[PDB]
Structure formats: structure tokens, C-alpha cells
């Protein structure tokens, strides 16, 4: 059975640093944990897979190489993303009273 399609929208959690540091402790602890280099493939995979499973949002292959540090991972997981259609965006962008937008799609 195919699971229902997942929504691409992702709002960063408020307890993002706490969750990320807990996962860092689980995987790898030292001071300045944001600078823990993710050069070991085993640890990189563990951390990123745990984060993806938890948050529902995964690092794309294009950004996987540039996620070199826990700081980079934190940046990627605190930048948000939305998946609403262009119609929804335009209609929710505070359309003036004299501007009517309709989709025949």
C-alpha cells in the first residue's frame, strides 16, 4: 500500500538547537558542537537520517556535500520551505480589492 503523499512544507521546530544537539550526542558531546566536522560517512549518515526521520525533511543530494558541519545542518533545518501552489500564494498575498485571480487548471 502506497502511503499518502507527504507535503513538502516544513516549518523549523522551535526546539531545533536542543533536538539537534541531542541527536549529535546520540551519534557522536564536546564544546562547540556546532563545529563537529561531518567528514565521517558513518556519522554523517546517522545524524542526517535521524534528523530526516524526526523532522520529515531530508537534505537533498545537491546540498548533502555542502552540509559539512553541524552548523550547516542547523542552517539547512532552520531555513523553512513551503509547497503551496502559485494560485494559493497569489490569493493569500493580500490581493487588492480590484485584482481578481482565477485558475482554469
Amino acid at each position: 500500500v502506497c502511503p499518502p503523499l507527504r507535503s513538502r512544507a516544513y516549518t523549523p521546530p522551535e526546539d531545533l538547537q536542543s533536538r539537534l544537539e541531542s541527536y549529535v550526542k546520540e551519534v557522536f558531546l564536546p564544546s562547540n558542537w556546532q563545529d563537529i566536522s561531518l567528514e565521517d560517512s558513518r556519522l554523517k549518515f546517522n545524524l542526517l537520517a535521524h534528523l530526516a526521520d524526526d523532522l520529515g525533511h531530508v537534505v537533498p543530494n545537491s546540498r548533502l556535500h555542502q552540509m559539512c558541519r553541524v552548523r550547516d545542518v542547523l542552517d539547512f533545518y532552520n531555513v523553512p520551505i513551503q509547497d503551496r501552489s502559485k494560485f494559493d500564494e497569489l490569493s493569500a498575498s493580500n490581493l487588492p480589492p480590484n485584482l481578481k485571480i482565477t485558475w482554469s487548471y
Partner: protein, 148 residues
């Protein structure tokens, strides 16, 4: 050419400036397409300019219709009943903005040869010349060679 084209006189829709200026443009219907390189500029205009234009011109109703189209278009309806349909096909954001602003600033009167660059309803203030102006009057209104 002028002889092969209709012509009109300089005029305003309802004396547009005497009391107050009324923007003649009333409706702007933008037929755009989700897909199709022809309407890329139209899509960018809808995203970045149409809202600003709408709020700048509160007297114009704008209808953005996104349907499958090979030639995106803009239909401008003016108070006088004139409809001007312009293709925004493969026009950049700047070109679309200039075209829309020209439509907004333009009256509904036909774009044909204007016979005179001016129009006065009261051309004369001192009295239109007639042959008897600048002609002196004679005693008892006697025409030349009249005896009595």
C-alpha cells in the same frame, strides 16, 4: 495613409479634465498560462507588478485568468466602450509594465489620425471674422453708386 484610414478630431470622453480627471481605463483582463515560454514575462508580471499596478490604479478592475494559452493577452476595456486587445506574447516584465501603463494612461478613443492637434469649443472671443468686419459703414447705409 491618411486617405486610406479613418480620422477623427481631438476630443475627450466627457470633458475629462474640466471638473476632475477620471481614468478612462476600467478593466484589464490578463490571459496568462502556467506553462509555455510565451507567457514567462506575463507570469513574472503577475507575480511582481500586477499587485502594485492594481493598488496604484484603484479604479481599474484586473482579471488575471491563468488558462492554457499559446499567446498570452491583455484586454483593456475603457469607460467609453472601447476594447483594446494587446498580445503580451514573449514580452519581458519591463515591456509588459510599459504596455500596461500606456493602456492605463490612454483614453478609449480610437488610435487614428487626429485632424487637428487642438480642439476649441470657443475659438473666438472677439467675434469670428466675417466680410463686413474691418469695413466702414456709410451714411444712411447707401451702397456704392446709389443715388438717394
Amino acid at each position: 495613409t491618411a486617405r486610406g484610414t479613418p480620422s477623427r478630431f481631438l476630443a475627450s470622453v466627457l470633458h475629462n479634465g474640466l471638473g476632475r480627471y477620471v481614468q478612462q481605463l476600467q478593466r484589464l483582463s490578463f490571459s496568462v498560462s502556467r506553462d509555455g515560454a510565451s507567457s514567462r514575462g506575463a507570469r513574472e508580471f503577475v507575480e511582481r507588478e500586477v499587485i502594485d499596478f492594481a493598488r496604484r490604479n484603484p479604479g481599474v478592475v484586473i482579471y488575471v485568468n491563468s488558462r492554457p494559452c499559446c499567446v498570452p493577452r491583455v484586454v483593456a476595456e475603457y469607460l467609453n466602450g472601447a476594447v483594446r486587445e494587446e498580445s503580451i506574447h514573449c514580452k519581458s516584465v519591463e515591456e509588459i509594465s510599459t504596455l500596461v501603463q500606456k493602456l492605463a494612461d490612454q483614453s478609449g478613443l480610437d488610435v487614428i489620425r487626429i485632424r487637428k492637434p487642438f480642439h476649441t469649443d470657443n475659438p473666438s472671443i472677439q467675434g469670428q471674422w466675417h466680410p463686413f468686419t474691418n469695413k466702414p459703414t456709410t451714411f444712411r447705409g447707401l451702397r456704392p453708386r446709389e443715388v438717394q
